[PDB]
Swiss-Prot record:
Regulation of activity: Alternates between an inactive form bound to GDP and an active form bound to GTP. Activated by a guanine nucleotide-exchange factor (GEF) and inactivated by a GTPase-activating protein (GAP).
Family: Belongs to the small GTPase superfamily. Ras family.
Phenotypic consequence of G60E: In NS6; hypermorphic mutation
Protein name: GTPase NRas
Disease: Leukemia, juvenile myelomonocytic: An aggressive pediatric myelodysplastic syndrome/myeloproliferative disorder characterized by malignant transformation in the hematopoietic stem cell compartment with proliferation of differentiated progeny. Patients have splenomegaly, enlarged lymph nodes, rashes, and hemorrhages. Noonan syndrome 6: A form of Noonan syndrome, a disease characterized by short stature, facial dysmorphic features such as hypertelorism, a downward eyeslant and low-set posteriorly rotated ears, and a high incidence of congenital heart defects and hypertrophic cardiomyopathy. Other features can include a short neck with webbing or redundancy of skin, deafness, motor delay, variable intellectual deficits, multiple skeletal defects, cryptorchidism, and bleeding diathesis.
Physiological role: Ras proteins bind GDP/GTP and possess intrinsic GTPase activity.
Gene3D superfamilies to which the protein is assigned, alphabetical: P-loop containing nucleotide triphosphate hydrolases
GO cellular component, one term: endoplasmic reticulum membrane
Keyword Lipid metabolism: no
Membrane topology: Lipid-anchor
Classification lineage: Eukaryota, Metazoa, Chordata, Craniata, Vertebrata
Gene label: NRAS
UniProt cross-references to SUPFAM superfamilies, sorted A to Z: P-loop containing nucleoside triphosphate hydrolases
Length: 163
């Protein structure tokens, strides 16, 4: 089967662990150790293709997992303006490490269930447009958009390999 190495990046507290646990274990984790960096495997069928996902949940970071990673979920929280601005730091570090401007990535606006929005969908669509990448809103709490974010990332890696 086809293997895909995904990296979940973003500021502390955006929901990287909650998003990873929601996809892997189908449950919402309200308090996961913020310093723990782990990897998870999941066998899934995406567009009729049996895939093995090797997902790294980062805890922030180093050029090494950026070298290994084939696709990046760049996560910010819709109630945290600083986490949205932090996206560019990850983008630029990934770009330098990979020596490329077309690295598979998806911009994720997590905590979409929260009414305390400080990042508008237009700000985020403008950011995603500038990078030339998809923008997906998610809620690791309700599961809304979780599969769409991770599977769009797989589809992006598949497209990149295909050219
Ligand atoms: N309301 C809401 N809370 C979330 C969501 N995702 C994560 N959280 C909470 O945000 C906090 C930080 O999440 P965590 O997954 O540890 O973030 P990380 O540091 O990026 O891994 C925890 O208290 C989570 O329960 C979400 O989509 N909605
Ligand atoms: C059973 N198939 C339906 C699987 C499937 N679903 C897709 C959806 C979008 C794009 C391609 C595909 C493929 C394959 N067809 C390809 O050209 C290709 C290239 C690399 C792969 O890893 C997989 C595929
Ligand atoms: C090999 N897999 C079973 C684990 C795993 N899954 C990944 C998905 C995307 C990117 C990297 C990885 C890795 C590791 N390979 C690394 O280079 C690295 C650096 C730091 C880590 O914490 C983990 C890894
Ligand atoms: Mg975490
Ligand atoms: Mg403002």
């Amino acid at each position: 089967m086809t293997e895909y190495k995904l990296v979940v990046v973003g500021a502390g507290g955006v929901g990287k662990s909650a998003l990873t646990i929601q996809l892997i274990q189908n449950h919402f984790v309200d308090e996961y150790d913020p310093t723990i960096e782990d990897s998870y495997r999941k066998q899934v069928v995406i567009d009729g293709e049996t895939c093995l996902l090797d997902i790294l949940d980062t805890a922030g970071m180093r050029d090494q997992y950026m070298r290994t990673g084939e696709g990046f979920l760049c996560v910010f929280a819709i109630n945290n303006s600083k986490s949205f601005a932090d996206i560019n730091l990850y983008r630029e570090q990934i770009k330098r490490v990979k020596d490329s401007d077309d690295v598979p990535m998806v911009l994720v606006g997590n905590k979409s269930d929260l009414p305390t929005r400080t990042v508008d969908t237009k700000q985020a669509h403008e950011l995603a447009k500038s990078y030339g990448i998809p923008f997906i809103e998610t809620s690791a709490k309700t599961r809304q958009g979780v599969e769409d974010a991770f599977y769009t990332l797989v589809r992006e890696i598949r497209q990149y390999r295909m050219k």
